[PDB]
Structure 1
Amino acid sequence: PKVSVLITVTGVDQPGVTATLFEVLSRHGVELLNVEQVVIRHRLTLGVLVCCPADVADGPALRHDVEAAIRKVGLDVSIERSDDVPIIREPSTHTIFVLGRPITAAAFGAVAREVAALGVNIDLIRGVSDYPVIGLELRVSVPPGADGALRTALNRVSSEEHVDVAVEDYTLERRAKRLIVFDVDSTLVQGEVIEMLAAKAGAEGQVAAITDAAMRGELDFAQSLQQRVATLAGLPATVIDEVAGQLELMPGARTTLRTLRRLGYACGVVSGGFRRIIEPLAEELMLDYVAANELEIVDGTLTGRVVGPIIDRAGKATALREFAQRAGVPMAQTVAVGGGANDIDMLAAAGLGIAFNAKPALREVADASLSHPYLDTVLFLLGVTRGEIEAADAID
């Protein structure tokens, strides 16, 4: 076959069309170069790019066989020479996630308009979830040196339209994510353990105020840790198990971890909280790595200090790096999820840094932000669909 021909079938989806078309093409000298077919909402698009004998292409017979077969059953078909035509479309450079509850038309309109303004072509759109939130994906092709401007434009859109918008590299390498770390407090676990410990001392007031002050980045994490843990001076150490037994996982956490195990992720937690609370939990969740701070105890009583070294903002990044080196995972294939300014160095070190219901100081430097109280929306950012989760879980 020395000449190329493109055949394009469109119309209301009926069964047997695919087989019929290729059964027809076999009565001509036809060899396949590319086939693309989808049905969206009962609309068939079937594009077939072939090579065929020069004398077959230059003859009405091939045309008449195809047009007869396809038009008969009710669909449309076009046939034309190619030769210059690209055989197989190029990969998308990036992918974009839009999560909302709801996603207004105006919101998605604003996204699609920012995309267009920056010469960014949309290659594919699909739904990735219908619960817990609506999730849409756009695989896009970004002009080189425009993706900074894109994330920026789309962040403005995200704030103004009340949806999450994440732009991610869609390269083979950068999208084989293999390792994830969570912060514990207000990320993997509901609320602040240190405030739960403080309530036992009748100090939740003092400590909640300082914690919000520290997670918004207004305070040095270490001095803030020292001032907060000091309020616990004199509590019996038995208070650690009490609080540990009062911890509720973030909605979607179990689903998030279970799905990450299916995908063969290394899973870890990096916290500024307390090891006696977190290790007992990390064992339960079957995690691969823990790093936390440690409460000082004397005669079964908390002294109000921690036992150095303190895991600070920098320490969190150092622990991610440590975890990644041990697991044999390059930094670009690592994921970090946090909610506080505590986590800023960690997120920026990771391949993908995800801010989860986060303070402004973190959202501003995070690769991606989530504003809904479901930790499994993290999974959508990692290329997983709700359907795929539900399917896999039903196999038990």
Structure 2
Amino acid sequence: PKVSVLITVTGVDQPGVTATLFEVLSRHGVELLNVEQVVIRHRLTLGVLVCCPADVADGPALRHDVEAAIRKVGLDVSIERSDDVPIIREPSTHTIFVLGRPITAAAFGAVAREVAALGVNIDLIRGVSDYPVIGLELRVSVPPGADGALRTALNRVSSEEHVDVAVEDYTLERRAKRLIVFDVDSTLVQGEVIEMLAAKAGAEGQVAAITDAAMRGELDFAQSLQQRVATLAGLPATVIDEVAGQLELMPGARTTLRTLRRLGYACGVVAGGFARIIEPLAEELMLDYVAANELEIVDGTLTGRVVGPIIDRAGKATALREFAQRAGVPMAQTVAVGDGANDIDMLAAAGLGIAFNAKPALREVADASLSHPYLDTVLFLLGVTRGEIEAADAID
């Protein structure tokens, strides 16, 4: 068949329209080239590009048979010669996420402005979560040389409007994600552990000052580690056990790992905290890798030093590429999720770094940003929807 022809049903959706349209097309010399159909709130769109013999396609026979059979049931339909038309659309060059509780129209409208301001076509939009946070995904195509300015744009927009914004490359390698590492304190686990231990030595005050002074990027990580652990010199090492019992998991964390197992992920943690305390919980979670510092003990009591080598900032980036080596996962399929300057070097070495309840020094450099203290929102940023999760969970 010689010449091409584009057909397009619009109108309220109903059953059988897709069948009806193609039986009808069989009666004329018709072979498909592309078919695109969707139903959004019942509005049916259907876009069939065919190429059929110039014989039939120059004839009113086809026109009348289609038009008649569509408008009969209550939908519109258009028919036009094609010849030059692109057969199948290009893929999207980036994907963007917008999340928040709530997402104001002004907020979302600002994202779309700055996206427009740069030449970026919104190729598609859809909602990924209604719980615990409205999240909406946008596949966008970006002018070459703009995407640096894009994340500049979007971060700003995020701050002024109180929504979380996230911009990944939507490419083949970059989307077979396979490896995730979590910080522990204030990411995977609620609270600072070095404060649960501090509070046992009645020095919860001094220590919590320094800790926030560090996680924000004001004191050398080693230097503030020594000094805070210094406060613990004297405690019976039984207290380690006491703090690993009190620990709580970030909300939704179980669901985050359980789902990250589904997609075949290697999951690990990377702290500057204390291996003896993550070692229990990283067993129960059946994690694949733990990199953490060691508390010195003598005759059963804590000396207040840490055993070296210390896992400083750059030690956390080191800590991840070692994992990514041991499991064979290149760096660009590696996910990292932190919450403080401690993690600046991890997130920037990972292929997709995620600031979670981050101090602002982090948000400034993470490829993405979540403000709201639910760890399941990490799933949405990785290609999953609240619908899938509850489906897969519900089957068991």
Q: What TM-score range do you get, normalising by the shorter chain?
A: over 0.9
How far does residue 354 in structure 1 lie from its aligned partner after superposition? 0.3
> 1-side partners of 2:188 and 2:345: how far apart?
18
Alignment partner of 1:174: what SS?
helix
Shift of 1:306: 0.4
Cα shift at 1:334? 0.2
Structure 1 residue 350: Cα displacement = 0.2
Distance in 2 of aligned mates of 1:362 and 1:165: 14
The whole-number CA distance in structure 2 between the counterparts of 1:309 and 1:39 is 58
What is the CA–CA distance in structure 1 between the aligned matches of 2:155 and 2:253, rounded to whole Å?
A: 26
Residue-by-residue CA offset, 1:326-346 (whole Å, 9 max, x unaligned):
100000110100001000000
Helix, strand or coil: the match of 1:165?
strand
The alignment-based identity, stated in percent, is 99
Please give the secondary structure, in 2, of the residue aligned with 1:103: coil
Give the superposition deviation at 1:67. 0.1
Per-residue CA deviations over 1:245-277 (Å, capped at 9, x if unaligned) read: 000000111111000000000000000000000
Paired positions, count: 396
Q: Distance in 1 between matches of 2:254 and 2:105?
A: 32
Deviations 1:150-203, CA, capped at 9 Å, x for gaps: 111011100000000101100111111100000000000000000000000000
* SS, match of residue 154 in structure 2: helix
Distance, in Å, in 1 between the alignment partners of 2:134 and 2:360 is 24
> What's 1:125 paired with?
125
Q: In the aligned structure 2, how far is the partner of 1:192 from the partner of 1:271?
A: 11
Distance 2:279 2:172 in 1: 34
Displacement of 1:96 = 0.5
In structure 1, stretches of 5+ residues that fail to align are none
The Cα shift of 1:279 comes to 1.0
How many angstroms does 1:103 deviate by? 0.1
Q: Which residue matches 2:313?
A: 313
After superposition, residues 109-258 of structure 1 pair within 5 angstroms as 109-258=109-258
Cα deviation, residue 317, structure 1: 0.4
Deviation readout 1:112-137 (Å, 9 max, x if unpaired):
11110100001100000000000001
Moved over 3 A (4+): none
2:299 corresponding residue in structure 1: 299
For residues 236 and 214 of structure 1, the distance between their equivalents in structure 2, rounded to whole angstroms, comes to 26
- The equivalent of 1:289 in structure 2 is 289
How far off is 1:204 after superposition? 0.5
Write out per-residue CA displacement over residues 32-65 of structure 1, whole angstroms, 9 at most, x where no aligned residue. 0000000000000000000101110000000000
Residues of 2 paired with 1:224 and 1:332: CA distance? 32
1:293, CA displacement in angstroms?
A: 0.3
State whether structure 2 residue 395 is matched by structure 1 residue 395. yes
Rounded Cα–Cα distance in structure 2 between residues aligned with 1:147 and 1:390: 34
What does 1:354-369 correspond to in 2, within 5 Å?
A: 354-369=354-369
Aligned-residue offset at 1:349: 0.2
Q: CA deviation at 1:213?
A: 0.4
CA distance in 1 between partners of 2:155 and 2:347 (Å) = 17
Q: CA deviation at 1:291?
A: 0.6
1:268 aligns with 2:250: no
Q: What do residues 270-295 of structure 1 show as CA deviations (whole Å, max 9, x unaligned)?
A: 00000000011111111000010000
Could you report, residue by residue, the CA deviation over 1:308-366 in whole angstroms, capped at 9, with x for unpaired residues?
00000011000101000110000011010000100000000000000000001111111
**Cα distance between partner residues in 1 of 2:207 and 2:71:** 74
- Distance apart, 1:239 and its partner CA: 0.2
Shift of 1:81: 0.2
The SS at the match of 2:255 is helix
Partners of 1:138 and 1:275 in 2: CA distance: 40
